[PDB]
Amino acid sequence: DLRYGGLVHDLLADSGKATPNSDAMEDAFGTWTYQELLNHSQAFSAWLDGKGVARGERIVVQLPNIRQTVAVFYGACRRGVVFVPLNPGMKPFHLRSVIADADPRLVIAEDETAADRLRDVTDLPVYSIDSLWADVERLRDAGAGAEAVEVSPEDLAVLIYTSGSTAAPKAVACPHQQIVFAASSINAVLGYHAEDIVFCRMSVSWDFGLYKVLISTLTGAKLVLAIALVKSLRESGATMMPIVPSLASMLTTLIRRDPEGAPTLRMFTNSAAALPQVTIDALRSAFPGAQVVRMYGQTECKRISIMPPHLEHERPDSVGLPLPGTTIEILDEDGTLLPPGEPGEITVTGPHVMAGYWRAPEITARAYRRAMRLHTGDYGHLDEDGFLYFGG
């Protein structure tokens, strides 16, 4: 089940052929089937071609959770163009630094006001998503962009900026194969399937939401890009919901106000940060059919460990087992393998370890070593069974 040597947009091409008429993406404004998503992705690729954006070049994209952004992502992958997603709400000087570090060919904004703000901070061409969507639709109607082009599994597909306002710009450089591999590996543990409906309140510009786009696409599921939270869940038929502590507490607070519940929910997946016992309990009480799944990871390799769903009640202090096909080792000060029970630096090896930081060899050399071993700067230990824990 694990995917090696893969290309990101092949996930879309596969599902576009296998299930063209299932629903792939719903946002506030409408729904696309897998066929529609592929059509618009191809059209967006022809637009890139029309603008002369070539293999290996970057585009910076600052867009909300809408179908168009997923088409931008895939259409760019299909041309070997590098997707550099940004959160709305960044401050001017922060934008200037990140954009210049990304060094793109062009910039896509949410609307004209946002595009004017972006023009203050770069001289590159900035395009409103609405304006340029008119062209993409014409291109779609003409059947443009169906042509494949040479893209290597080793080509960069995404830059994920992890640096805050107060930091030097720093992005993880993510090639196609690692991305596909990590999506297949996460999914081998979590088991999304074609009949799932994924309710995603997370931004698809954060790798958390991005991989919900990938994993839905890998498996044929439907992704729903989102106070009336409980109703939305129930009425969408939501089965899988990625969460963060803050979103989980809000959900348990809201559910008391709504005794109709959301019985279709079968799994909550938590990355980001420790979910406290009380929230866990409250979720299970409100959705007794739903598993509450712990995970740990960093952007530098997408994800490190997942507690298998069937073991959700066990080893409360663990953040789970390594992703299938990957290795976690605990190293001493001198870089030597520690035995079980012993505290050390959590290190990681495998086909998910990303390519380093974009154009920052020095900083990369200190995290990525020998590179093939990621040193996380987190400390913890493994038990005999291979489960991961923090500290000693």
Extract the tokens encoding 355: 């390519």
3-class SS of residue 366: helix
Q: What's the resolution in A?
A: 2.2
**Cβ(216)–Cβ(44) under 8 Å?**
no
User: How far is residue 15's CA from residue 193's CA, in Å, rounded to a whole number?
Assistant: 12
**The 3-state secondary structure of 246-307, one letter per residue:** HHHHHHHHHHCCCCCCCCCCCEEEECCCCCCHHHHHHHHHHCCCCEEEEEECCHHHCCCEEC
Spatial distance between the Cα atoms of 301 and 369, rounded to a whole number of angstroms? 13
> What is the per-residue burial (b if ≥16 Cβ within 10 Å, else e) of 5-24?
ebbbbbbbbebbeeeeeebb
> Edge-to-edge strands of the sheet including 156-161?
126-128, 106-109, 58-61, 82-85, 156-161, 171-175
**Could you count the other beta carbons within 10 Å of the beta carbon of residue 278?**
10
d(CA 165, CA 264): 39
Q: Residue 382 and residue 375: Cα distance in Å, rounded?
A: 16
d(CA 97, CA 83): 17
CATH code at position 42: 3.40.50.12780
204's enclosing H/E stretch is none
d(C-alpha 104, C-alpha 96), whole Å = 12
In whole angstroms, give the CA distance from residue 163 to residue 360: 13
Where the chain is discontinuous (C–N > 2.5 Å), the residues before each break are 226, 370
Residues contacting residue 259 through CB under 8 Å, at least 6 positions apart: none
Name the residue among 172, 253, 262, 264 with its Cα closest to residue 210: 172
Three-state secondary-structure class, residue 75: helix
> Which residue, 155, 154, 160, is CA-closest to 173?
160
Residue 185 in contact with residue 192, Cβ under 8 Å?
no
Helices and strands counted in the chain (H then E): 12, 20
Which amino acid is residue 328, in one-letter code? I
Residue 206: how many other CB atoms lie within 10 Å: 15
What sign does the dihedral 61-65-71-77 (CA atoms) show?
positive
The tally of CA atoms less than 13 A away on the side-chain side of residue 93 is 5
Q: How far is CA 175 from CA 150, 153, 161, 302, 353, in A?
A: 15, 7, 14, 12, 10
Beta bridge partners of residue 4, listed in sequence order: none
Q: Give me the number of domains the chain comprises.
A: 1
Nearest to 73 by CA among 213, 180, 212: 213
Q: What CA–CA distance (Å, rounded) separates 211 from 136?
A: 25
Cβ neighbours, 10 Å, residue 341: 12
Cα(50)–Cα(37) distance, integer angstroms: 20
Q: Which domain holds residue 115?
A: 1-392
**Rounded to whole angstroms, how far apart are CA atoms 298 and 319?**
13
Q: What are phi and psi of 173, to 5 degrees?
A: -95, 120
Q: What angle do CA 8, 293, 276 make, to 5 degrees?
A: 130
